[PDB]
Design a protein around this ligand. Structure first.
Ligand SMILES: OC[C@H]1O[C@@H](O)[C@H](O)[C@@H](O)[C@H]1O
Ligand SMILES: [Ca+2]
Ligand code: NA
Ligand code: NA
Length: 139
C-alpha cells in the first residue's frame, strides 16, 4: 500500500518557486493532483534533474507511481531512472525506461528492496522540463 505522503520530505535538484500550482518539490507529495513539482525555468536548469523522497523510515518497497500534471504536458517525464538510498547520500539504480508523454499514471513495479529515500531521475521530459503532480511509494 502507498506510504503516507505526510511522513515524507521531498527535495529536488531544481525546483521552480511557488507561482501557484508549481513548482516546489513538496507539491509532488501533497495529495493534490492540481499542484506539481516543476524544474526551475526562466532560465531553464537543463535535464537531467531529479526529485528525492525521504520516506520517513526504512521500508521494503516494491512499487512507485508517477502522476503527470493534468491538462498540459510541459515536464511530462519520458525517459527516467528510479534510484534508492539507505543513507540519503549514496544511491543505486533499480529501474529505468521510457514513458509516453500522456497524462496517464505511470507505474513501476520492481524487486522488493530496502530504502529510506527514493529518487526519480528525469533524463528527458516534454519541453526539456521535468514535472510531477503526485508521486507515491508502495511497501
Ligand atoms: O516555460 C515553462 C512553463 O510553461 C508554461 O506554459 C507552463 O504552464 C508551466 O507549467 C511551465 O512549463
Ligand atoms: Ca501535487
Ligand atoms: Na529493519
Ligand atoms: Na533481477
Amino acid at each position: 500500500s502507498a506510504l503516507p505522503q505526510g511522513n515524507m520530505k521531498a527535495t529536488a535538484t531544481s525546483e521552480h518557486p511557488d507561482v501557484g500550482n508549481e513548482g516546489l518539490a513538496k507539491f509532488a507529495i501533497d495529495g493534490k493532483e492540481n499542484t506539481i513539482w516543476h524544474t526551475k525555468y526562466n532560465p531553464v536548469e537543463e535535464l537531467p534533474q531529479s526529485i528525492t523522497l525521504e520516506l520517513g523510515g526504512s521500508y521494503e518497497i516494491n512499487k512507485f507511481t508517477y502522476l503527470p500534471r493534468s491538462g498540459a504536458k510541459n515536464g511530462n517525464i519520458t525517459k527516467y531512472e528510479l534510484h534508492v538510498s539507505e543513507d540519503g547520500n549514496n544511491f543505486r539504480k533499480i529501474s529505468e525506461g521510457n514513458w509516453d508523454d500522456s497524462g496517464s499514471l505511470k507505474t513501476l513495479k520492481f524487486n522488493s528492496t530496502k530504502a529510506t529515500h527514493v529518487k526519480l531521475v528525469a533524463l528527458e521530459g516534454v519541453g526539456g522540463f521535468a514535472s510531477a503532480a503526485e508521486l507515491n511509494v508502495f511497501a
